[PDB]
C-alpha positions as a printed Julia matrix, in Angstrom:
75×3 Matrix{Float64}:
 -6.17   10.1    20.64
 -6.77    8.53   17.5
 -3.42    5.97   15.7
 -3.36    5.93   11.84
 -0.81    6.85    9.95
 -0.78    3.75    7.76
  1.61    2.49    5.63
  4.3     4.94    3.9
  5.29    6.64    0.76
  8.71    6.4    -0.96
  9.52    7.44   -4.29
 12.12    4.53   -6.77
 15.1     7.02   -7.46
 15.74    4.68   -9.32
 13.84    2.42  -12.45
 14.35   -1.28  -10.45
 13.65   -4.39  -13.4
 14.14   -7.49  -10.61
 11.98   -9.06  -13.55
 15.27  -10.05  -14.47
 16.16  -12.56  -12.84
 13.74  -12.64   -9.68
 14.44  -14.91   -6.52
 14.55  -18.82   -6.72
 11.24  -19.9    -4.09
 10.02  -19.92   -1.37
  8.36  -16.56   -1.31
  7.61  -14.02   -4.84
 10.32  -12.4    -6.99
 10.08   -7.75   -5.67
  8.66   -5.42   -8.33
  9.94   -3.4    -9.95
  9.94    0.58   -9.43
 10.58    3.13  -12.26
 12.08    6.55  -11.14
  9.35    8.68  -10.06
  6.96    5.98   -9.12
  4.84    6.3    -5.63
  5.27    2.98   -4.04
  3.06    2.48   -0.63
  5.25    0.4     1.92
  3.7    -1.1     5.02
  5.81   -1.41    8.28
  9.44   -1.91    9.09
 11.88   -3.61    6.2
 13.8    -7.44    6.19
 17.43   -8.5     7.18
 18.08   -7.44    3.44
 16.2    -4.92    3.64
 13.13   -4.67    1.37
  9.86   -3.0     2.2
  7.09   -4.3     1.66
  5.02   -2.31   -0.66
  2.94   -2.32   -3.79
  2.8    -0.02   -7.37
 -0.19   -1.39   -9.92
 -1.51   -3.93   -7.97
  0.9    -6.04   -6.77
  2.81   -6.66   -3.67
  5.76   -7.94   -3.09
  9.02   -7.71   -1.72
 10.68   -4.0    -2.44
 14.11   -2.26   -2.38
 14.96   -0.28    0.71
 17.82    2.02   -0.65
 16.37    2.61   -3.55
 13.31    4.4    -2.68
 13.57    8.02   -1.48
 11.51    9.16    2.0
  9.43   11.89   -0.24
  9.26   15.59    2.33
  6.46   18.5     2.66
  6.04   20.78    0.23
  3.86   23.59    0.81
  3.09   27.23   -1.64
């Protein structure tokens, strides 16, 4: 049929402020998430357990533990 499911949608259960003491080098620091920030990720995570998403036009590695797997609502 038609293959889809391009990227996932998760929310930052907590306010992640990696800006304070970002990584060293050989890449790029993580993204700062806020309580209730619907960020879009892509593909699996890395050895460290970080996902590849972007929030606010900024790509970077996000925490795969702070995020929350949304559910299917219905009325």
